[model samples]
Structures are given as structure tokens and as C-alpha cells.
Target chain A: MNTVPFTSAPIEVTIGIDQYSFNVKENQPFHGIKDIPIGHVHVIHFQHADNSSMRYGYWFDCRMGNFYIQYDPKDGLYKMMEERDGAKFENIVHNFKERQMMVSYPKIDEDDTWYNLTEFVQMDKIRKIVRKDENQFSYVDSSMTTVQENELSDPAHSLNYTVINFKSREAIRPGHEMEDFLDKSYYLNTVMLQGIFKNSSNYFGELQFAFLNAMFFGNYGSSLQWHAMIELICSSATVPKHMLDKLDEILYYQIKTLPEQYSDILLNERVWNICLYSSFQKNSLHNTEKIMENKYPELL
Target chain B: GAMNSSNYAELFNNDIKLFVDDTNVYRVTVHKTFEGNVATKAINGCIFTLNPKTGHLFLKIIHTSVWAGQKRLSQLAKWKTAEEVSALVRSLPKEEQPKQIIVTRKAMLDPLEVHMLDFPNIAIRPTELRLPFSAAMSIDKLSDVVMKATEPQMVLFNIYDDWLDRISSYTAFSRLTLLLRALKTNEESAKMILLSDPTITIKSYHLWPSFTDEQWITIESQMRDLILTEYGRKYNV
Candidate 1:
């Protein structure tokens, strides 16, 4: 199958307190609250073979000021256009046929100019890694194929569109768990929780405030807050009730009652615990599914 | 005392009347009530009222949103919501009111509330209304929101349900801490009344561990000063 040639949709990241969602070329001219840009997400729709693939750009843990997706006719791969971190307006980071690289800030001592938070060192104590070639962090459905191939071949083709329902796929890859880094469930969980912070900087210090205040106190844009509000409510509706119950236990018993000693380590590595329950939840759901299938074959 | 729900109806009215005064030395009473399904642990509740000239009495029921995992916090206060608190203040006699309005829900004093406070008579007493627990719930719309994660935004509102509960209660206690402080500054003897079951202690999540024993004692002492009852004593931390 060949790649489908479709015009890209206009996409933009939300900014400012009002969450004034401006295009790629908008700015907050006025002095508002302690406004700093935060969590950058690139939603790209590109031709992977004949199907349009939408996914997050391969960058977490760091904020990129300006990010956009453009399909290059020369190379089949769509370009994720962005500069290095701290690139602001008029100082846009250009990824001209960019390197397939992921930006990471080592929590410990490293003279990387991109990360200049000495205060965050105590919290983020791990000097992590990123090899040259293994940058595909947010990997989604790689095997994109056009079920409707006639649209591309039709001589007198009208705008043929097939809107198939997005069904969650279950796949078992033969590899170590860490190497299978790109789990869609993780992305789903990330999207739900990520909305809490739009333009969130100084994550370590910000993490101290309760998650609710962290945003308002952290100075998240209104849109992110709005989306966060919606998503948080939606999450309860979507996630199973038992999960919330166990989460309540983890939060209250484990995280809350930290005996002054492990508080720093727990808070610093809060990101790890963030999805701890959910990853555990998937297996829980798998067993649940198995039982339901056995008992009610038709219903499941 | 641990009073029955029905007994609380009369107890609150009589208990609150003892503190209702036209005298100087400002006094604030915090009365808490629960609404929605308490049996299902979905009863959301919290405190406030503004009496112009006279000190204010607050009966705020923390909204059910937090319990049901459908809560939202706003940096900018909603005009209509803020106005309601202001309007209540304006209705009371303007004279003999406290100079400052103490609040835990920051949005309560948003522009209009601030403006109403400016009105000569009420001089509206309010406070640091940060981390209010009164955001609306999506229970009515929960069925509508119930959809598979695969479904689009038209239906789903997926979130960390536990995070909402933890953070909601977390902020609520933070608000309570500030609320207690504001009440303590009332100068006169402030009365803190619990309209819920005496057994209806705050089994709040994340709040106990967040505060030290000293801090918890300090906040509890403030409430104790107003109400002789040891409210929220069961906190393990």
C-alpha cells in the first residue's frame, strides 16, 4: 500500500490564563499572572502507508516552546518542527529536517544548558539516558494500512472519506517490558492527567502543592484547567470504580502518610507513582475480561 | 455530641443562635452540612454567611463534586457565584460588620464580591478563599459521560478519580486551616458548629499526612476554641 496524500489540519497549543488558544503565531502581549509556557504536545496526522496516523510527538519531561508537524514530500516521514528547549517567541526552535532526537534533562549534575534547575536536582536524582537511535517514545500504530484503497486509485475520485470508529486494540509484543515503552494505555493516561498542566514550568516545586492547586498556583492556562476539569471528571466515568478505591488507598495510606523520611524521594519521583496503579489496572482489567468472557460469552 | 441527622436540624439552629450577636468584637461561626448521598460516600459539604453590621454566620456545604470525582478549580472566580455570596452580604445590615471578609474559597471574593465589600454598610467580612470544595458535580451527567476510553470527547471525561478525591480533600483541609485562622481572628468568641453527625468526622484523604501533628493540633485547636468538641480527632497522623 502507498501513503495517502491529505492536506494537514491547522493545529495550535493553548497558552495564557484565559487559555487563549492561538494559532502557531499568537502571543500574550500583556503582563498577566506568573505566566510561563508548559507541557508541549505535538498532535501530528501523517501518512503512514495509506492511513493517517495521529500521535504525540516523541518528547516528554521537557517543554518545547513552538512545535508543529509538516509532511516533507522529499522524505516520506513527517517532520516534527521545533527547536531546542527555552526557545520562545521570535526565538522559535527550527527543526529543519531535524534529527530524530529526544530532549532530556538529567536530574543530577550534568552541564546541559537546556536544563538549568539546580534546585530540581534533589528531586530528580536519576541521570537517565537516550541513545542516538532509540527516540521513538510515543510510538502508536505503526502498521497503517488503507482498508479502503479504492479512494487513492479512482480516476474520477470524489473526496472519499471513511470514518471508522477508533477501537482500542490489544496487542502482545514479544519483548522485554521496558523496550515495549510505547503503550497506548500510557498515552491515554498521560492525556487525561496531562491536561492538568498547560504551560507548567518548575515541575519539582510545583509538584508540592496538591495537584489541584499546583495548576492554579503553578499558573496553568485556563484552557488546560478547563480540559483538566473535564478530563478529571471523565476519568472517573471512564476508569473502573475499583481503581479509584485502590487509588484512594495509595494516596491516603502510602503517599500521604510518608513518615517525614521518604517524603523527598516520593515527591521527587512522583511521576513514577503517578501511573503505578493504572499499569497495574490493565492487568486487573485483563483478568476481568477473561472472567466476563467465560461467564457471559455473548455479552463480553 | 454525635447527634442524629434529624437531631442536627434543631441542634444547629439553637447552637448557632447563642453566637448570633449585635455586639462588637467580631465573631464568626462555621456550620457544615452534607447534601447528596452520604451513604454512598457521595455527600459533599463545606461553610459561610455574611451578616452586615453584625458578624456573619456561614453554613457552607462542600459541593458533592469532590466526592463523586467531578470537581474543578478556577483561578478566575465566576461572576454569578461570587455575586451570590455578595448579595447575601448586601442583604444584611451594613453597619457593625468586620472590616475584612475571610474566606477559604478564593473565588468567593472575586471582583464583584470585592466590589460589594466596598459598599459602606456591610464592609463585608471575607478571607483567603483558596481551594474551595464547592465546585459542582457531574453526577447528573455522569451517565452521559460514561463511555469507553476509546470514545471521543463528546462523551468521555477520563481522569485520575483518586487524584481528584485526594487533591480535593487536600485543598479542603488547606482551606479549613485558613478558615480556622480567619475565624480565630474574629476577636470575639467564635463558635464552630458541625451540622453533620459527630461521627461524621473528616475521614479526609491525604490531609492527615500532609500536616504535622503540631499543625493538625493548631488547626484542631482553632476549631476547638469555637466548638468545645474535638472535631477531626481521629486523624492517624
Candidate 2:
């Protein structure tokens, strides 16, 4: 395992329409979403203190001065505009002459729909507002409606807020993306296997075993049969030496022939239940044989 | 001072040992010790004798309590097999070892008796013989029987006579194929089979008990669906 010094410092940023302030660190340039100009955006990443490496973050459009909270943020914005011609909306504006400030949803596509934060507050659609500093503010908007729950009880409407920072830097050097530090495929497989192991149902456990069996033996079977096979091998009075030998041989061959990513995941602790159990039984039998041979030298 | 049976019992009251006498008889002296006295003392002792030639193994209570004597005899009987007895005997000197201990038919415990003793709680059900539908047993007759059969019955196919012995011979996929075949021919029977969740059971082995009741239920449900899905694809239904 490689360890990097915790060199990055936490920077306060506001995610799209979420009332709470999020502390994030500058991450590598965002290559995940396509068609978004790389030069005009800043990717900020956040991870829990417990897991520093497995980070999930959002892209901040530097030109629009708003964070893209939704996964397809660029697509949503572009689809909102009716005209295909290249045109951009000023999402945040400071009317210096009128000594007023305003914020509006981006008009990426031709849509008659629009939202103005100032108009919402003036119309009493916003219930509460919190000004943390000169540039940052959070508010609750009651105007937005959702069918999932009562309008008064909806959390999405109550938690909506916006932050404004005019003095923020335009851009910074792009750092290494999440791909540089974390193996995406391995992480996903680990998560999937973890879910299977944590589940209380035998179906998942059998499926996990079957998956590993297929990986090693190149064959598939019903979860029931896989489970039966497992029980047969594990519960037998005598060690199934042939089965153990074949498992060892096939797993070794898989390690040799399969990609390093798959091989590493197969041997990972999260997904290694079947292989681990097989190894343990094989070792136990081997040790017992050795002890017996030592105790009764002539018996063999 | 004659060395009669009573006198012999009194003479070895405090000893525990095993030996093969010159007459090719195996003797095990068992003594029960009582603690919490001036010193630990042997309260009772018994002698178990095994005559290899006749395969007559019995216990002499001697001066020991009847319970103590029976307990000692039960312990001696636990050796179970000739090989186990031979292993125990191998600890003796080469010349003291018996040439062979032939256990007659009557001397060996029945398999059911052994199983009962080992697992007292589990009831040993007799294996039900289920013959597949064949030309001799026409489909019409079998269909009538299957339709009336109870729901969620296991249609187990014994692929191998001795499943535990030949467990390693067949892969999981082969067993799946066997189970699928059991479902294919018995179409009307298949609905009843699928309803009950069909599985392959090995002959002469109780591998089903290895899974919990809940696990078994889940396995059945999963297998039922899997079989149906496979059946649909194979028949283009």
C-alpha cells in the first residue's frame, strides 16, 4: 500500500442547493463527465474522515459559479435551453448600480422555466435565511414542490440554499484524478462482495460462492447446487483431497492467466471467503496428516 | 488364598491399564477415583476382556459399583472399529500384540445404532425410493400421482450411488444438468416438482442436514426458479 502525506487542506465550498457547508479538498481535474470544458471548471472532492482515499466530489463550473450537484449536471443545463446556438446565462449577477445581488438557475437549454433567488425571497417563498459571512448565505425555499411528500414536509425544498463567493480564485492547477490514486474496478468489486458477505440471506452467500467457482473453473451452476457442493466438501468426515487439489490447481492457474485486477480482487479479503475456506480445510488436513505420521511412523 | 474371580477383582481394584495376555486376550482395567479425601483414592475398578479369537468382549464388575462397571464397559465399546482397536494396541510392545482381532458379525454395532448414538436428537428417516417416469411406468400414471402429491416436495435424484465417496467425481454443473433432466421429462410432474423445489440427493448420505431449515428453503426456492428459467430456454417455452 502506498501512503501519501495529507498535504491538502480543507476548503469550504457549498454544494448545489444544499443548505449545509461542505469541506472539500482540491482534486485532480474532472475527466469523468464529457463535453464540459476542462479549463472552465474546478473539481473539488470530499471523503469522510474514516475513508480518505475513497472520495466522491462534484464539479464546480468556474464560469457559472455554481456547483454541479446532479450527476449529469452539464447535460441537465444544456437540455434546459431551447436554442442549440452557443449561448450562456449569467447565473449570478451583482447589480452595482442598484446595490442589489441576484442568483438564477442556469439556462443551458431553451426552457421557459426560470428561478430567481431574490424574487423568491421577496415573494415570501423563502422561509428562513442564514448569512454566515459577507459572501456566503444559506436559505430554505418553500416554493419548490414534490409529489413524494407534503410540500411543507418535503426536505428537498426546505434544505435548498445558495452560496456566493466573488473573491474566489478563477482556476488552479489540475491535480491527479481519482483514477490515479484508487482502482475503480477493484473498489467497485470490493463494495459488491462486501454487500454479499454482509447480507443475511443464503442466496447471496451461495451466489458469491458460485461466482468464485465460475471464475476458477469456468462453469456456472444454480446457487443451490453450489451451496450443496460447498456443504459436501466442508462437512465430509474425510478431507476431499482431490477436490482440494483441484481447487488449488485451478485457483493458481486463474491467478496466472487472469488480469492482475481480477486476480487481486479474487484474492482480496472481501471476496476470498470460498478460497479462504478451501485453503483452511486443506491446511487443516495437511497438518493432521503430518501429526499422524509423526505419531505413528510405521502406520503409513 | 486361591486366585478366584472375586479375589482377582479385589487384587487390581486401584489400577487402570490395558494389556494383551499370553492367551491373546485384551484386558482393560478401569478404576474410578474419588477426590477430596486425605488423598485421591480409587473408589472402584472393573476389568473389560476382549477375546480376539471368539470376538467376545465383556466386562467383569469385580468390586466396582454396577454403574461404574457399565460406564467403563461403554467407554471400552467406544473403540468402534478393528482399526481403532489396532491403533490402541499398537502402543503395546511388538511381542505382546495379538496377531489379529477378528470381529465377528454380531460383535459389530449396526450403522443405524451408531448414528443414533452419535446424534440422539436427529431422527433417522428411511431413504424413500423414487423411480423416475419410464415406459414401464407410463407418464399418465405418474402424472396422476404427481398431481396429488404434497406441495414443496423434493424431487431428489441420486446421481451417484455413494455420493460422499464420489463427491469429487462430478462438478457442480454436472449435478445441475442432472437436476434439470429430472425436471424436463416429468412436465406435469415438473410443476409439482417445481412447486416443492426439486434437488439432487446423494444415496446413502444425509447431506441435506448440513444446511439449516431456512437455508434449505432458500436453496429450494432458488433452484426452483433456476430450473424453470433453464427449462423455458431449452424448450423455447
Candidate 3:
């Protein structure tokens, strides 16, 4: 309730990702991997918030470089790693060599400069916001309680934090039909699957020779190399009966097979036929209460 | 694969071997025991043998995307959970064997069996580890977190039950993404839960989309007043 210099309105958009179908009840185990809803997200990085030092930067999408949270890379992680031992791989897109060429890039503005990333954050707090654009996206420490008393407190006494609000310009938003509770389920499931694949270190791409990244989606990360290894096992062995069954069941419902392309990912914006139809059926069941209760209590 | 936990086990168990001589990493070709066909599969695993006479630790594991990129594109190699992979380093053939990258597609193998392998044991310090806050769970703990969140550190973890209520609306995918990140991220993100509240919440997710700012304020105000009124319960000061 306290007034802050930035963010013109009290209503702030809390951006987040979604979770798909997971078992939520005792008796009803998740029938299958169903995509479900996850709440609004404001992923926090305590190191950046707790510490008084550093600059801010986006760590996602196509934009390059921002303050990274990993241990200094120059010092490197292991022994015999001479060049990058304990080196701080700060995420700012800059030249850190030549001893004096550290260019501090502020995420909020294209023109703003800084001696260090943290310095830029402090300056942003004080900089006046213009009518044209508030360039101010911030972190809200849940504080300055009570609607009554909070209204009278100073913004500083309440909540005041800063963030770059780094987001995908072509960010995916829910579609009209997908907006329904049912369709959202599939969307959530797909997103979860993507995250799982991204985190897995089981598959492998090329090296010395194979498919070039340009041919694929660029760096699939070494985490995926186990694919070749797994295939080797399969050839020597079999697709372990269990795994083949899983892939079969999973692709059957999820519509993930090659011939069964639901959404034209190749084209980029159409809804998946299977997912959409499934969503329609999900809505027909009339079950929007659970999400409402867990996330949108006020609506009830 | 997770739904078919068994299949996931199969996927991780499959592997191809490779050896490193001096500098170049060589892929090992092997003939199938059951079939006559020779397989030129990708080298999925590596193991470095340390020479007992020397104190060098041997590093093994087929050169990976991380290593290949590090060499080719000058890209920084990162598999943030490399330490987990380092467990194999302890088993090197003494001294002459240097620390090695032991990579494999052995995940699909029975987890209980893989964990039983004999390897050189090294002392691990418990105190040096700091878990990510997201890793913590419990409604009581979450309430305390929100109450103590003088800052934004008080975030919710995943709630298993909320999915059953009305999951279609919640951002389960996003929550899952964060959960995955929590497992692999270096330190800070590692604090996030692999499965629990404060990360993915079906309970609160059911509550968020419905409330208007005004309604939220009114409800919050009323809740506060109720506690202060006849229902107020005293606790440790």
C-alpha cells in the first residue's frame, strides 16, 4: 500500500509458467501425465536480493548475457583447469578482458550505463519514471501489512525491490480456446514435458560428426549424449519392454508421434487439434473448481 | 517416461563405451553378444584410470556436447551438476590414473543396482552444502516464510493436491520447469524442491486467478481483523 517511486499502479502483472497433470488427490492417482495449472511466478534469486552488490540482467530467451548465478568460472570448478579457475562468469554482455573493458549493461534501459550491475539497480530506484513509460519493474517483498495501516506507510517502509523484467518479446500467451480450463491442461502438460527434456542429460547430439546444431536446434547440450549409449544397449539388448510400453502410452494420449502432429509447430501459431479437442472434453466435465480454490480464492 | 517409470529406467541403462588416448577421444566399437551385427554407437560413457604408483586421478566419460562445444565453439562448458558426475572420479586406478569424466547411458539400468557399484570413496563434507529455499516444504513452513518474507524470498512450493481440484488453470508446466531447475541449478536454484509446496501449489493456484485487487484487499483486511478480534490466538512473543 505504501507509495513507491516506480510502478504507477498497485496492480502488477505476475508472470509465471504452468504445470501439467500431476496427482493431486489421494484416491485418484494421476490417470496419465496430464498438464495442470501452476500459479503465478516471481522466481527469486536471494544472492542478487540479499547481497548489496551487482548489476541486473535477463537470463532467458534470445537476449544474450546477464548476471549469471554460477560460481566464478575463471577459477574454474575442478583441478588442472588453469585458465578459468574461480572466474566469475557475470551475465552481462561485455568484454571482461583487457583488464579495463568491463561494460556494465543495465537490463531496464538500452542507454543506461553503470560502474557495476548493482550500482545500476540503485540508480534505477531513484530515477524518475516518465509518462510515456515507467521502465520500472520491481520485486515486492511481502510487507507493510494491513490495508488500513499499509496505506499510510512510506514505500520504502513497505516493499521496494528492482528487477529487469526480462521476457520473451514473442512470449507465448494462452489462446482463446486454450484459455479454457481444459485446453490449459494440455498446454501445461506440454510445457512440463519441454522442461523435463531440457533438464535431462540422457540424449546425445553430434560431435567429431553427426547432425550440426544449425541442422538441429543449436546446442542440445552434452546432457543429451546418452542417446547413443542407450541405443547401443537396445541393439545389444531390446527396447526394455517397459520403455517401449511407456513411449507407446505416452505418445498415444499426448499426440507426440511424427504422423500425428497436433499443433503445427513448424508453422508456429495454430492450436493442436487433439489438445484442443481434449480440452473441450475436459471443460464438458465441469471441473474448474479445483484451480479456483487453490489459486483464485477471491473468485469464489 | 516418468509415468512409465520402468521405461525411464530402461533409457538410463543403455550405454556405449569410449576411450581417451593422450588427447583424442576414440569411440569404441563393439559386436552385440546376441546379434552378429557390429554396432558403431555413440560413446555414451567414459572412465579414467588413475595409476596407483602416481597420485593422478583418471577422468573418463565419452567427450560430450559440453566438452565438444568447449573445444570447438569456444563455448563455456556447463552441466552445472558436474559434481554429481564426479562421483566416478574416486574409483580411478591409483596415481597414474588422473581424474576422469565417467559418462554413460546407464540411467535406464536399475537404480538400486547402479548405486551398488564399487568405487574409490572420498570424504564428502556435509556442512559445505546449502540447500535452495525452494527445496523446503510444509504448509507451516510456508506460512512462516510468507510471514517472514520481509522481502520476496517467501515463495510457495508445489502442492500435490491442487492438481486434482482444478489443475487445468494452474501453471503446472511452469512449476515443473522451476522444479527441474531447482534440481540442476548451482546452489541458489538447488534450494527449490524436487517435489513439494512453495514451488508448485495447487492449493494457492486454485485461489489466485479468481481474486480482484479490491477483493484481495478486503479479504486480507478481514482475515487480519478476525485474528485480532475474538479469534486472536497468542503465541511466543
Candidate 4:
């Protein structure tokens, strides 16, 4: 199996009105199972002003292939003593008082001691904590497991269903066949748009229409008229602000990565029309032609 | 008593105003006596308004009667004169007649030309005339028609191919709904195996790994069996 190193930029999170920063570093090499290297451990260390710190560890469980996080509450730090055990021996303590959970393993030296809290608390509790004017610490013991049973139960045994981060970029490859590239690009744009628009009840139907029109555009280039129509419908005020922002991000990514052969003035014109339609702003109504010129001067 | 010739004459006696208003580009108002009060109401008809800025013509339907309104709109597309429009309304059964008929110069535009107008900048494309085919026609009827023209296996393969092609364009709920309709047994397993990524929605299935030859073969066999079983129950196969 091939191994890839793991490193990530520092992540900042806010908890209880205080901002916390953490660094992610590889704690163990990825182990291969069934010819795929799917298991690796990463340590997240949060630094504090007084030289005090909190640490957490997360990794894919090789045996069950389940992703697990381990953090202990007693010492306010996470320990990674048994990286190879694959979270099989872990125990979960749901703190009903705080609506959070502490996961840990038994400590070796002490009779009743356990490793520090393993899993980070649920995000909902963290959000509630942050929004409050005051905060308090509380805990209670209620044990449960995060490992979900496979959809099939006892009578039947069965069966199942990442873009890797920080992978080195490869050189640009030669252009694929025109139709093939169009099909793939259509799929990419539609899927990315779906992720952005799926949660909004108002735009879900429009998104599906956009998807169908996008497919038609890929199949027959003449259907640009239909494609533009659907895009305009999706670019309405009814769509959420964040969703539109994400859509612009995806479209920008697509325009940048467009193939050179398909990057002629006509295709670029069509692309610009879609961008203009999807990025329409009603409040700041500017001249459509000038707006396109100002925002996408390169297209012009 | 039903509306007689005298009532029809009285209804048509009111002049219909066909003029563009500030809000609507093409507005048609008619004065009518409703429950003892004489009130003005917009006629039930189609209004085509063109935005000079975007070159988009919007077709707004204010029809209270669905089928009759569609017929009048279709007829108004062909008829030229206000008298012809009035005569068309008079020709209709008294119950079907609108309170008054209003026709503008733009109403004379050819229906085909109206449909063929290219408005790429609009939110909705021009409505193209299509043959009357009930979209809700049953799958059993479709299978019967296809099986009559070809072999059952060919129809089955086509269904399988179309299902594969379109599965990636729908949501999880829609994909499951389609699965239940097409495949009988092991729908959950089929959805799981087809998607291969629990986190991936059906719309993002293209991003998931493609099925290997063995995996494809297994799924194909399962699908064929399920489809055949469903069809057998219906057709007494």
C-alpha cells in the first residue's frame, strides 16, 4: 500500500465566546486493509495562553472501517495510547447535563482511572454554549456507542457502500475528448450546485430543473437557451445569500478549469451568460452588459 | 332559468377595455354586474408582455376556466377582429362564454412565431407545442407498448439503461421512489450498492467509484430478476 503524509493548516474554532486554535498533525502512518490504505490517525492540539493545552485524536477504525474521535473530560485533554486498537475498547459517557459526550478507554496504572475524554462534544451543544451570555460546566454518566449497526440485522449479514486533502498537484494533463469532458464538467457543476441548494426547500425544484437543463446543454450544445433560462430562475432573491455565494465559488472554479478546446469565444460567451444569470442582483440593478464587463473583464 | 338570448345581449352590451396598464403591459378589463354590484374585473385571457430591456415576452394567463381559457387563447391567436372575437364567444355555449371578449393587435401574432421566439435571457423558455401525451401514463401501459414492439429483454435493458443514466440526477428520496417503482426486491441494498458512498446523495453519484465488471454483473442480474418478477405478476408471465 502507498502512504501519503497528512498536514493541515491551523483550524480556529470559537467555544463559549473564546476563540481556540488547533494544529493537525499526523500521529500514525496509514494502514492498508483490503488493498486500500484507509486508516490513519491525526492529533489536534489546542494551545492556550497560560501554556495549558487541550488535545484530541481522530482516526479511521481499521477493523470496522468506522471513523472515531476520542477525547477525555477528566484532564481536559485527549490521549492516543491505543491507536492500533481501532476504537473497539472505547466507552461513551453521554453527559445529559451538558448535552455532550465524553469517550475514553481504561487507564492502565489506576484502578478506576480512564484516559482523558476522547470524542469532542457534539457541535449543537458547542453552538448553544457560544450563543449564551454565560456558561457553566456540568456532566452526567449515560453510556452509548457511536458505532451504528449495519442496516441489516441478525438474520442477514451484509453489505455496504474523500477527496484526499493536501495531495500534491499534478501537471495539467492533455485535453480529454470534447463530449467526455462536457459530460464530466456537467456532472461536476450539477453535483456542486446540488450540495449548495439541496437544503433550501424553495430552490430544490429549481435546482433539479437546472440539473436537467444542464444535462441537456451537455448533450446538445444548442440547448443553451434552456440552460440560461433555468440558471436565471435559480438566481432569484428567494435563494439564500450563502447558497448564492457558494454557487459563485463553484462557477468561478469551473470557469478557471475549463478546457482550452472548449474555451473559445462562443463557449466563453455562453459561460458568461450563465454567470450573469445566476449572479443577478435585484437591489443593485446595474446595466447587464456593463455588469458582465466589470465583474468578468477577462470574458469580455 | 339559464342565461337566455336577452342575458347574452346584456352581457355583451358592456364595452371591454383592451389597453396596457402601468403594472401590466397588456391589460383587459370588463365591467360586469356581480351579486347586484357593478364591478370591473380583468377578463380571463392570456396576456403576452414583452420586456423591451431583456427582449423577454412573458405569457400571463388569468384564466379562471382551464380548458375553455386554453381554447379561447388558441382561437384568439388566430382571430383578428373584435367582432370575430365577439362572434367566437357568442358561438360558445352560454355557460362557457366569458363575460366579455377583449382582443388587442398583439393577439393576432402567430402562435408558432410566438413559441419560436428565442428569449435566452428569460427565466422561462417559450412554451413549445407538444403532442398531447399524458405524462402520468402508467408504467404497465408503457411496458405493454414497448413489449409489443420488441422483446421483453430489450425493454428491460432499456429500462435498466435509462434508470442508470437518470439516477444521478435526482435526490435520495426521488431515487428511492424510482427504485421502488422499477425494482421490487432489495431496493435498499440496490441503492446502497449503486451509490457506494453513504454520504453521497444520488445527485452526486457520478463522483463515486464506478462499478467493476463483477459488481455491475451482480447488480444487473438482480435488477433483471426483480423487474421480471414485477412484470410477471402483472402480465401472468
Order the numbered candidates by TM-score, best leading: 4, 1, 2, 3
Model 2 agreement with the true structure over B148-203: per-residue lDDT tens digits? 44332212222222333423322322333344344555445543543453444322
TM-score against truth, every candidate: 0.19, 0.16, 0.14, 0.21
lDDT string for model 1 (A1-300, tens) is: 001111242223221111112222122121111112233221222223332333212222224133344445565444544433443422222231132121221223343221221212221211121122223222211221222333224223111111111111111122212111223333223332343222122222222212212121221221122222222322232444554443333233223223344333223222222232244343333333344334333322
On the 0 to 100 scale, the lDDT of residue A232 in model 3 is: 22
- Once fitted onto the true fold, the runs of candidate 2 whose alpha carbons sit more than 4 angstroms away are A1-49, A52-246, A253-300, B1-237
Judge candidate 2 at residue A102 and give its lDDT.
17
Q: Which segments of candidate 1 are over 4 A away from where they belong?
A: A1-234, A239-275, A278-300, B1-46, B51-237
Clashing pairs in 2: A28-A175, A80-A109, A81-A109, A81-A110, A82-A109, A82-A110, B152-B196, B153-B196
Residue B65 in model 2: shift from native, Å?
Answer: 25
Q: Output the number of the TM-score-best candidate.
A: 4
User: In model 3 chain A, which range of ten residues has the least summed lDDT?
Assistant: A1-10
Candidate 4 global CA lDDT score? 0.29
**In candidate 1, what are the lDDT values of residues B1-237, reduced to their tens digit?**
222233323322322211111111111234444764333233222223322112223332333342233222221123323343444455556443333443433333333333443443333323322322222111222222221212222222221123233344334333443444434343233323321224434323211123334554565555555533223333432
Supply candidate 3's per-residue lDDT for A24.
23
**TM-scores (chain A) of the candidates:** 0.24, 0.18, 0.18, 0.24
> What is the DockQ score, from 0 to 1, of model 4?
0.01
How many clashes does the backbone of model 3 have? 128
